[PDB]
Design a protein around this nucleic acid. Sequence first.
RNA 1: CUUGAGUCUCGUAGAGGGGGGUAGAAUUCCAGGUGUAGCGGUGAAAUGCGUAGAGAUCUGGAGGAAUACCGGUGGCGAAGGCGGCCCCCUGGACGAAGACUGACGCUCAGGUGCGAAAGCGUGGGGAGCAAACAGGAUUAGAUACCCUGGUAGUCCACGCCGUAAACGAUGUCGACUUGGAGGUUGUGCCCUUGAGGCGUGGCUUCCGGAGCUAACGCGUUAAGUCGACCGCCUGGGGAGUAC
Lengths: 117, 65, 106, 88, 99
Amino acid sequence: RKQVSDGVAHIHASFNNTIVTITDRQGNALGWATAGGSGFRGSRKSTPFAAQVAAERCADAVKEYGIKNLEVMVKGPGPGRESTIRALNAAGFRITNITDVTPIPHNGCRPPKKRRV
Amino acid sequence: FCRFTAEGVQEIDYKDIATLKNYITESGKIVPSRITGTRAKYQRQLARAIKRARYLSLLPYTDRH
Amino acid sequence: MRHYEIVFMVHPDQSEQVPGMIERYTAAITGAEGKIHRLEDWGRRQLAYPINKLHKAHYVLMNVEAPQEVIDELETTFRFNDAVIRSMVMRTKHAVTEASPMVKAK
Amino acid sequence: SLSTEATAKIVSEFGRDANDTGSTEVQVALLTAQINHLQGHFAEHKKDHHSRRGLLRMVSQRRKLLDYLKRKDVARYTQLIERLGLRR
Amino acid sequence: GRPQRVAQEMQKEIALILQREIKDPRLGMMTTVSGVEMSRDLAYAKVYVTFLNDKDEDAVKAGIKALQEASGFIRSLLGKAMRLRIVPELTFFYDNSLV
RNA sequence: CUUGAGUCUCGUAGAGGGGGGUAGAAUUCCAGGUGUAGCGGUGAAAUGCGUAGAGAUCUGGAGGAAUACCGGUGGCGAAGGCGGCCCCCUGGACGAAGACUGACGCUCAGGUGCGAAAGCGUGGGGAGCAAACAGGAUUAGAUACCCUGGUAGUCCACGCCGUAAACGAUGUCGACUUGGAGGUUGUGCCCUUGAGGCGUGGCUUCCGGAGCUAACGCGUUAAGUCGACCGCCUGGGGAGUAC
Ligand SMILES: [Mg+2]
Ligand SMILES: [Mg+2]
Ligand SMILES: [Mg+2]
Ligand SMILES: [Mg+2]
Ligand SMILES: [Mg+2]
Ligand SMILES: [Mg+2]
Ligand SMILES: [Mg+2]
Ligand SMILES: [Mg+2]
Ligand SMILES: [Mg+2]
Ligand SMILES: [Mg+2]
Ligand SMILES: [Mg+2]
Ligand SMILES: [Mg+2]
Ligand SMILES: [Mg+2]
Ligand SMILES: [Mg+2]
Ligand SMILES: [Mg+2]
Ligand SMILES: [Mg+2]
Ligand SMILES: [Mg+2]
Ligand SMILES: [Mg+2]
Ligand SMILES: [Mg+2]
Ligand SMILES: [Mg+2]
Ligand SMILES: [Mg+2]
Ligand SMILES: [Mg+2]
């Protein structure tokens, strides 16, 4: 409801979903839409088209906060980073920088065993 | 290439931040000798000096802070 | 009787407390029949990452030639003092009496 | 290992002259000095097996040096093994 | 196993080893992978890479060229990573998402 | 006697070993700020998670385990193995120039020690991971593969176990025999000196000559030409089983 006019969009790009959330520069969130919550499931739940649909649905819920300046931070090399980026770029937003911030450990924990498929 | 051999330095100071910044990326991770052309001995010295400088907070570990 | 490079940082809120600690440690290491080949007070500097939600720590360097006993109780004092946030004791095969790059800029 | 002062003193003591570092006597003396010193190390680092391999090697070579000495001239052999308190 | 399950898994693994374990400055652009399709036999696989830089062929050409030249390296990494029998031969293709 | 084998002196490189500290990412959890209906998962699904407010996001804290980048067709170690940084104790290797000892050597049945992982005993710890197990699916069938959970275990201390495709499927030591291209680590001499040139050692990777080999291949780090000692083999199965 207020005016910040300079926010940041976290894009959790999972291999099964894509979570876009715009937040105040100090981590306080404003709104969010998901590729799942945009009426998609199964395969389509993780397709770039559904990713851009979710990006636009989330943009349509923060426009009343009055922002068109964004930095975006992407996490997870899932399909649906390119899509949401170009979507929120085609939503009248000005993106100053895009940043890969996926959490990479320095050999922290043992990962789950590989799937035998 | 092999700049340290031209310098002739016995050891690379971890206090020489100006020099060390030329061997880390913006991410803050060490650059392999494969592209800087550094001799293996001096690349090991660089790794040790950079890790020491990171400990003393003279260089960042990552770019996320 | 080895050579040591001792670099430690001080809480910036105790910046003027520094020379006291400096001269105290030098007196301790010299009264233990251990020389001192260098001592530089780099002063307040901006950290490259927070340390206990903090920046602008007070760096100070020393170069000593001393026995291991005085060095270990010195690092013990470092541990049990809280005005110092982070210390570092390293060895050196020789004696270094020169200018650190953090004073050549000065 | 041994410091330069310790080795220099042991050479001067058991050797013929200052630069008699090769005699069987000084070799046995250096070996037993290092062994006695390493006893304290292995009293507490009892699972340092690599250093213990090195120690066992030096024990073995002291044994064969002593055997060569006993076979060369038993008088000096006995005098040495009594000056060091060995072979008992 | 079934070629499409292996396709999904190999897409995950190629995306992973493509984001992290690359050093070719020719690569970059947050290179994503839209998917990968492979034959009934797991011997061959075609990856559909999607670039971000301007779609001008001067750059996407160089990207696919670098990918095809590093295919051996990516194949070695895949073979040690994803635990299958034959380490398929990889063929990269620009997925023209803009139609 | 000094040529083998050792000792001393000065140095060099190293994830060699034991002990103690400490740092920074990440996973999990706990407590808050923001913020709302999904999250998670699959080839599709459900079991699972959330309206007590999850997931996502920022801040703070706890705890355990492992150390991205450097990183290497690298290095060290007898082998197994060893990877942040710092200190302490400690083993070996190599080089230069000498000095010293004077065959003190090589191999080794029995013997002694070391010896991945799993496992065992006692106590502690327990984030992640995960046999067994519990579900959800798939399937003719699933007691498998896939999914959600998940105990032992993985971690530490002290003992035990003594086995691996413990592999270079190649015992140790010594001598000799055309080359070429690298890596790594010393070192000598010379040039206006860094740079560069000419040497000379150690270790190591890859082609290949003669020779060898059933062939594949090996090829100065031999599987070539010889010597010393040790281990071992004698058709497949029965069986590394019975006693
Ligand atoms: Mg999927
Ligand atoms: Mg020795
Ligand atoms: Mg070590
Ligand atoms: Mg706990
Ligand atoms: Mg040593
Ligand atoms: Mg003589
Ligand atoms: Mg035997
Ligand atoms: Mg075990
Ligand atoms: Mg049991
Ligand atoms: Mg146990
Ligand atoms: Mg227990
Ligand atoms: Mg699990
Ligand atoms: Mg066997
Ligand atoms: Mg092995
Ligand atoms: Mg065998
Ligand atoms: Mg030989
Ligand atoms: Mg070796
Ligand atoms: Mg060959
Ligand atoms: Mg032979
Ligand atoms: Mg043969
Ligand atoms: Mg038979
Ligand atoms: Mg049996």
